[PDB]
């Protein structure tokens, strides 16, 4: 039984995917602006701080594609105060029980729970994702909430790769049988599953590479160096 309107559900439904926080963009939606009764209530006179300035006190090579972080503000939220006293957030408590709040500069997204526990995403840096973590928890801080910017550590990387060569799946899949999962007919990439480092690699014929599992960007460029070889004997001449 999916219930996502109770918090542990929702903050561990970010985490706990096939692929994890891969799949973030899942609950960061918010309110659907085409339609009209979906809009988060906001009262008269709330402030947009999505421009906030202020901070709390604290060859081929893969591309970073998104940072998941985590930050604890150290208090308890009332969510619909928050939501109600900041036009740049969003919250659906039926849908998904955490503030969907967002900031254009780093440009990321916030999911901020009751407990004072926050998922920050969408930052391609980890000075991006720090950045952002502490507008964020400055915005609570001005809203009313007594939030302090502690904990902070990335959950999780994403790399993309473009190697330029059709890869040939079939005989990757059996070839390494043990760390691959392919199924065409239900998803159209090899998952390639390596040990060490501990990543998870999406492998399309196009020679398209998404690395996930990395809380370390040294991890996605290790994966890498470890699958090319790999592809380049599976390369469709
Ligand atoms: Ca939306
Ligand atoms: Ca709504
Ligand atoms: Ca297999
Ligand atoms: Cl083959």
Do not use: W
């Amino acid at each position: 039984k999916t219930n996502l309107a109770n918090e542990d559900e929702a903050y561990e439904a970010i985490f706990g995917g096939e692929f994890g926080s891969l799949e973030i963009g899942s609950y960061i939606g918010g309110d659907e602006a085409r339609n009209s009764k979906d809009y988060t209530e906001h009262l008269p006179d709330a402030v947009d701080f999505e421009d906030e300035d202020e901070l709390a006190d604290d060859g081929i090579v893969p591309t970073l594609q998104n940072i998941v972080a985590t930050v604890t503000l150290g208090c308890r939220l009332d969510l619909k105060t928050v939501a109600l006293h900041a036009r740049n957030a969003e919250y659906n408590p039926k849908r998904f029980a955490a503030v969907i709040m967002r900031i254009r500069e780093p440009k990321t997204t916030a999911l901020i729970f009751a407990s004072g526990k926050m998922v920050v995403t969408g930052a391609k840096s980890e000075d991006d994702s720090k950045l952002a973590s502490r507008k964020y928890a400055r915005i609570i801080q001005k809203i009313g909430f007594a939030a302090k910017f502690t904990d902070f550590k990335i959950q999780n990387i994403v790399g993309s790769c473009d190697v330029k060569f059709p890869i040939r799946l079939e005989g990757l899949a059996f070839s390494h049988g043990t760390f691959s999962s392919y199924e065409p007919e239900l998803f159209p990439g090899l998952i390639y599953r390596m040990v060490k480092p501990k990543i998870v690699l999406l492998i399309f014929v196009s020679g398209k590479i998404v690395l996930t599992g990395a809380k370390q960007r040294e991890e996605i460029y290790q994966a890498f160096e470890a699958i090319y070889p790999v592809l380049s004997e599976f390369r469709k001449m």
